[PDB]
Amino acid sequence: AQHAVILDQEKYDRILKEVPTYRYVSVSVLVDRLKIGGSLARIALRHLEKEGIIKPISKHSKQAIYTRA
Amino acid sequence: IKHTLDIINVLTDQNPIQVVVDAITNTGPREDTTRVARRQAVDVSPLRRVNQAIALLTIGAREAAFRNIKTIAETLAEELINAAKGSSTSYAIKKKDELERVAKSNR
Amino acid sequence: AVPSVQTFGKKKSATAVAHVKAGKGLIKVNGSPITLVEPEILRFKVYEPLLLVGLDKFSNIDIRVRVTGGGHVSQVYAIRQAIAKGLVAYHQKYVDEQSKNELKKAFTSYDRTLLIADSRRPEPK
Amino acid sequence: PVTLAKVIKVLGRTGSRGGVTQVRVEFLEDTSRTIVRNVKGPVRENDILVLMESEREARR
Amino acid sequence: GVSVRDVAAQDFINAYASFLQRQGKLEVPGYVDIVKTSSGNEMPPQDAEGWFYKRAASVARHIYMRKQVGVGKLNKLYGGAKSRGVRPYKHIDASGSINRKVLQALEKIGIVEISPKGGRRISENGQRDLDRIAAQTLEED
Amino acid sequence: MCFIVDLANSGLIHCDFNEFNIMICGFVVIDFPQCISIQHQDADYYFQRDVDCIRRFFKKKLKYEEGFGDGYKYAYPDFKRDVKRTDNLDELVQASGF
RNA sequence: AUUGCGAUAACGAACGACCUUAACCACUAAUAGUGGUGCUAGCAUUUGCUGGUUCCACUUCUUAGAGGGACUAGGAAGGAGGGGUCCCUUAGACGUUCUGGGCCGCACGCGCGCUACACUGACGGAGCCAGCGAGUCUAACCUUGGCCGAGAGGUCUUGGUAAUCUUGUGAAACUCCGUCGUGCUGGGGAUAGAGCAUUGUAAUUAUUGCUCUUCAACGAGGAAUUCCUAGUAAGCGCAAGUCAUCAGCUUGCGUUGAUUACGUCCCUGCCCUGUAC
């Protein structure tokens, strides 16, 4: 199998409902329990944070840490 | 380390420096063996107990994050949390158990 | 003219030099405000001599420092020492000896290296 | 279960390489009942051991 | 008042590069997007359009803080390690041809001028320009 | 795999049965440093190393992963299986462990 | 340690086993540094803040040279280093010099190393910091600045016989912001093709440098085995040596900076204290 690198409508719908469930989210988490590739995860986090669904606590390019709120 | 304490403050909710102290105290072996061939069981001193705990924790983290996707901070955080619990899933807890049960066999 | 002193600090091959004089509390390193010292992760290592005694102590004096040689880390340890030594030298001359030793008690409680160079040296051949 | 004991005297180095120290240790729960034990790491007076077996005595 | 020394480095540079690009007076060499900028590099600059403006801003600040500079010192400044394959790394200087045109371009818009004792020095109009952008960058906070 | 079983039957365990001392069934084994008897207290621990060392090689380089493997009803040998003290050759040469 | 009390057929005598560093302070001097003064730019306008370029004061920082500062007493420190050099043989005789080749050839064995197997990373942009050296008139060494070129490199001038100029040797690792997403992959760069330069009388079997293309083994290494106790190991780079050109080498220097003992005679090795053998 291979991670997805282009976003189908099904996973887009999946992301928006699943992500608010998690205590802690990071690039590694989205690649693990969802199945998107790392290049999607970096895009998703910036979008979801802008949209206000996840709360930042620190950002460092080589690490990122967001929380449920 | 700076990133690690942040993660521990979100997975679970304790003061993270408290979680570190628990992992240290909970992990250090309390009995060991020496070569005499044959082996004999002996007690271990409090200072060596601290040294052993630190070494086991970071070695477990390093190997978990080689050829990884998770970063060092992710795996180190997970080790510490699992070891503050009694959870045998942590690398360090397994190592402690083997040392002590072998010592029991030889004493 | 105006009350002033100068003092120096050392680490390994860095040499910080500080001038202290009466004025309005400003602290600059190489002409830049101390909030910009770099690397970022070590920046609190320089705030120590300020927060440890309290900011109210500085309102009447200007500190400006130059740092010269060494490396990125060693020169950070130089400047913090030059500030601390500079502060007591000003009190020693222009106020009572009581407040002077009040300062020392605070510094040497936290970290001896704020006043005394560590004296380590490269191993000879 | 575990038993705590306090180091009151250090007796000497032992073992084929000197890797082990013999020590005289006093039980913490009640004084006396002193026993002699072998300790692997660096140790000093007033250190506390966790004796996981109690009724056993160092060789001599 | 405010001086360039009052602002963080990779914050002034980003602001000024964005401003300088909008004015459109800064003349680009045209061979841009082929050149590596260094014989030690591998692959060209990754930001295909913007990178020339970014360097123009950096040079202006570096001169402002100093007495004067010339092209040779800039090549040392922007140099780096080259891999040399199986042999150990070594320091190598950057491209001269990029830096020379950067200085010539800034001189046409009057930020910089030729100094006695050689090299380039900041113009008084350069001071006035850079000090204005500094003020805006803090005020945006 | 079957070669290891034979030695264990006859009473001996090679210490380092791995690619540094096999030459190229067309193989032949070229030396036997520090062999030990089946009676040694650590016999199983060394036994599993030989099996594990040979499995690693066929997986890593050759991609492979009555007999053993595919086409045989048991995957690979195990210390408490197919060891039956056939010949006690470890008494003719007192290798180690009486 | 033949380094000492005592004892007493003994008493009194002879070689081997002082000199320089680290570290505090008076004195020098300036080719090093600081402050003030005159002029002057920008910002702001209590009269400040950050700079550029004519004199004056000083010596604390630097300097380097000189002088003094542990004896077993807590403290800078209870140290580091200096066996070898009478016989025979003689015409082109144990010669002179020129051109070309070899010392670099390789089924293999033994050994010191360099680069890697990646995310504690690779690549791009930005930030931005040392110490020890060495340099021409004998003539052409170290080279700033201007111009040309994608680059390597070229060209016109300039300072220095040097604490003065190259040189603040603006070194690398490192720090910040982005791309990549675990796939021998954008890890790794051997082997090989085409072209452009530089040294030299001469680069073919190819000194070295640059550009595009080619893209190998290698997924942390068996039995064995080396060095190491603090500014030390290890990581990173620079200068000198040899030298027309040519380093993965040797010595020195700095930058970042741990873990683990403070012991023993188990292994290896050295040293000392019954019998005519």
From Swiss-Prot, chain A:
Q: Which parts of the chain span the membrane according to its record?
A: none
For this chain, one GO molecular function annotation is:
structural constituent of ribosome
Q: Which UniProt keywords apply?
A: Cytoplasm, Methylation, Ribonucleoprotein, Ribosomal protein
Cellular location(s) = Cytoplasm
Question: One cellular component GO annotation, for this chain's record?
Answer: cytosol
One GO biological-process annotation of the entry reads: cytoplasmic translation
- The primary site where this protein sits is cytoplasm
What the protein does?
Answer: Component of the ribosome, a large ribonucleoprotein complex responsible for the synthesis of proteins in the cell. The small ribosomal subunit (SSU) binds messenger RNAs (mRNAs) and translates the encoded message by selecting cognate aminoacyl-transfer RNA (tRNA) molecules. The large subunit (LSU) contains the ribosomal catalytic site termed the peptidyl transferase center (PTC), which catalyzes the formation of peptide bonds, thereby polymerizing the amino acids delivered by tRNAs into a polypeptide chain.
Query: What family name appears in the similarity comment?
Result: Belongs to the eukaryotic ribosomal protein eS25 family.
Q: What else is known?
A: It is presumed that the precursor part of S25 is engaged in assembling of the small subunit, thus being essential in ribosome maturation. Present with 322000 molecules/cell in log phase SD medium.
- Protein name in the entry: Small ribosomal subunit protein eS25A
Curated annotation (Swiss-Prot), chain C:
User: Any idea where this protein resides?
Assistant: Cytoplasm
A single GO molecular-function term is:
structural constituent of ribosome
Per the UniProt record, one Pfam family is Ribosomal_S9
InterPro entries on file = Ribosomal_Su5_D2-typ_SF, Ribosomal_uS9, Ribosomal_uS9_CS, Ribsml_uS5_D2-typ_fold_subgr
Record bears the keyword Ribonucleoprotein: yes
| Alphabetized UniProt keyword annotations | Acetylation, Cytoplasm, Isopeptide bond, Phosphoprotein, Ribonucleoprotein, Ribosomal protein, Ubl conjugation
- Per the record, the major location class is cytoplasm
Task: Spell out which residues are annotated as carrying Phosphothreonine.
Answer: 68
Q: Which GO terms describe its biological process?
A: maturation of SSU-rRNA from tricistronic rRNA transcript (SSU-rRNA, 5.8S rRNA, LSU-rRNA); translational initiation
* Phosphoserine: residues carrying this PTM: 32, 59, 74
Which portions of this protein are annotated as coiled-coil regions? none
**UniProt crosslink position (Glycyl lysine isopeptide (Lys-Gly) (interchain with G-Cter in ubiquitin)):** 28, 45, 57
Assigned GO CC terms: 90S preribosome; cytosol; cytosolic small ribosomal subunit
What does this protein do, in the record's words? Component of the ribosome, a large ribonucleoprotein complex responsible for the synthesis of proteins in the cell. The small ribosomal subunit (SSU) binds messenger RNAs (mRNAs) and translates the encoded message by selecting cognate aminoacyl-transfer RNA (tRNA) molecules. The large subunit (LSU) contains the ribosomal catalytic site termed the peptidyl transferase center (PTC), which catalyzes the formation of peptide bonds, thereby polymerizing the amino acids delivered by tRNAs into a polypeptide chain.
Miscellaneous field: Present with 33800 molecules/cell in log phase SD medium. There are 2 genes for uS9 in yeast.
The record's family statement is:
Belongs to the universal ribosomal protein uS9 family.
What is the protein name for this chain? Small ribosomal subunit protein uS9A
Organism (species): Saccharomyces cerevisiae (strain ATCC 204508 / S288c)
Swiss-Prot record, chain D:
One GO cellular component term, please give it. Answer: cytosolic small ribosomal subunit
Q: What is the lineage of its organism?
A: Eukaryota, Fungi, Dikarya, Ascomycota, Saccharomycotina
Listed PROSITE patterns: RIBOSOMAL_S28E
Predominant location category? cytoplasm
Family per record: Belongs to the eukaryotic ribosomal protein eS28 family.
Q: What is this protein called?
A: Small ribosomal subunit protein eS28A
One Gene Ontology MF term? structural constituent of ribosome
Q: Is-annotated flag, keyword Ribosomal protein?
A: yes
Q: Which organism is it from?
A: Saccharomyces cerevisiae (strain ATCC 204508 / S288c)
Curated annotation (Swiss-Prot), chain F:
PTM details?
Answer: Autophosphorylated.
Question: Where is it localised?
Answer: Cytoplasm; Nucleus
Domain of life (superkingdom): Eukaryota
Q: Which residues form the active site?
A: 16 (proton acceptor)
What miscellaneous comment appears in this entry? Present with 10300 molecules/cell in log phase SD medium.
Subunit description = Component of a late pre-40S ribosomal particle, composed of the 40S ribosomal proteins and the non-ribosomal factors DIM1, DIM2, ENP1, HRR25, LTV1, NOB1, RIO2 and TSR1.
What does the sequence similarity comment in the record state about its family?
Answer: Belongs to the protein kinase superfamily. RIO-type Ser/Thr kinase family.
The record's function comment reads:
Required for the final endonucleolytic cleavage of 20S pre-rRNA at site D in the cytoplasm, converting it into the mature 18S rRNA. Involved in normal export of the pre-40S particles from the nucleus to the cytoplasm. No longer associates with pre-40S subunits in RPS19 disruptions, suggesting it acts after the ribosomal protein in 18S rRNA maturation.
Q: What is this protein called?
A: Serine/threonine-protein kinase RIO2
Report where the shown chain sits in the full-length sequence: first residue, last residue, total length: 214 to 330 of 425
